[PDB]
UniProtKB/Swiss-Prot annotation:
GO cellular component: cell outer membrane
Family according to the record: Belongs to the transglycosylase Slt family.
UniProt KW keywords: Cell outer membrane, Cell wall biogenesis/degradation, Lipoprotein, Lyase, Membrane, Palmitate, Signal
Enzymatic class: lyase
Domain of life: Bacteria
Any Gene Ontology biological process: cell wall macromolecule catabolic process
Organism: Escherichia coli (strain K12)
Gene3D superfamilies referenced in this protein's UniProt entry, alphabetically: 1.10.530.10
The protein's role, per its UniProt record: Murein-degrading enzyme. May play a role in recycling of muropeptides during cell elongation and/or cell division. Preferentially cleaves at a distance of more than two disaccharide units from the ends of the glycan chain. Prefers cross-linked murein in vivo.
The organism's taxonomic lineage, starting at the top: Bacteria, Pseudomonadati, Pseudomonadota, Gammaproteobacteria, Enterobacterales
Protein's UniProt name: Endo-type membrane-bound lytic murein transglycosylase A
Amino acid sequence: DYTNPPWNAKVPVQRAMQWMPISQKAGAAWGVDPQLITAIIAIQSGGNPNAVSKSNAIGLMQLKASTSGRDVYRRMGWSGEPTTSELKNPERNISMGAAYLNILETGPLAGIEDPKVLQYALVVSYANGAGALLRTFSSDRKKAISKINDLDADEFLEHVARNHPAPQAPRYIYKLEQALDAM
Ligand SMILES: CC(=O)N[C@@H]1[C@@H](O)[C@H](O[C@@H]2O[C@H](CO)[C@@H](O[C@@H]3O[C@H](CO)[C@@H](O[C@@H]4O[C@H](CO)[C@@H](O[C@@H]5O[C@H](CO)[C@@H](O)[C@H](O)[C@H]5NC(C)=O)[C@H](O)[C@H]4NC(C)=O)[C@H](O)[C@H]3NC(C)=O)[C@H](O)[C@H]2NC(C)=O)[C@@H](CO)O[C@H]1O
């Protein structure tokens, strides 16, 4: 199951808390909880700004140029996508991750009223994609939402654990909570 193997948030949180001044800046700019940004950093890279994955996600918030990067750039009115170089810059990385969270929050995920579930929707949508999250409820965006609103955090987490194709989906929520406890 997804609680396995357990995760000790403390050190990843210890190194992620160092960027808080930046997360506060980025968070204010994009209307995003600075701790949520910090939680993702901790879960995604453990706070190393030079992090590069197998799938080729970059930096502190582990952004993929060709998806989240492309999306933020489009939100800005810019063509193309960020270079790997930009994304290793902590500030560029964090602001762009925060921008991506606001994009999710005001696009695909618009409509979640319960902010605790919403914060759950965001970590799963961030790490595995919004559409992937939504199609576990229905192929229609608005129907998927109305269902989501009839759940409490514990229920939404249930549904994720068994109706979400990716096994890691529910584990991000767990790591999340492990990260918020460690703040
Ligand atoms: C190595 C290390 O140190 N740590 C690893 C860590 O890297 C691993 O996790 C990885 O995390 C990153 C981000 O944290 C993951 O990146 C995800 O990947 C998603 C899957 O591809 C991606 O979802 C897609 O995003 C697109 C853009 O938003 C979606 O397209 C858009 O659809 C919208 C509606 O749905 C539409 O309105 C837009 O027009 C459209 N835009 C475009 C440009 O297409 C697309 O639908 C969506 N896919 C799905 C299925 O929903 C996320 O955007 C992307 N997030 C970010 C922030 O980049 C990455 O996938 C993870 N790695 C791997 C290999 O999967 C972690 C794994 O457990 O391990 C750590 O240790």
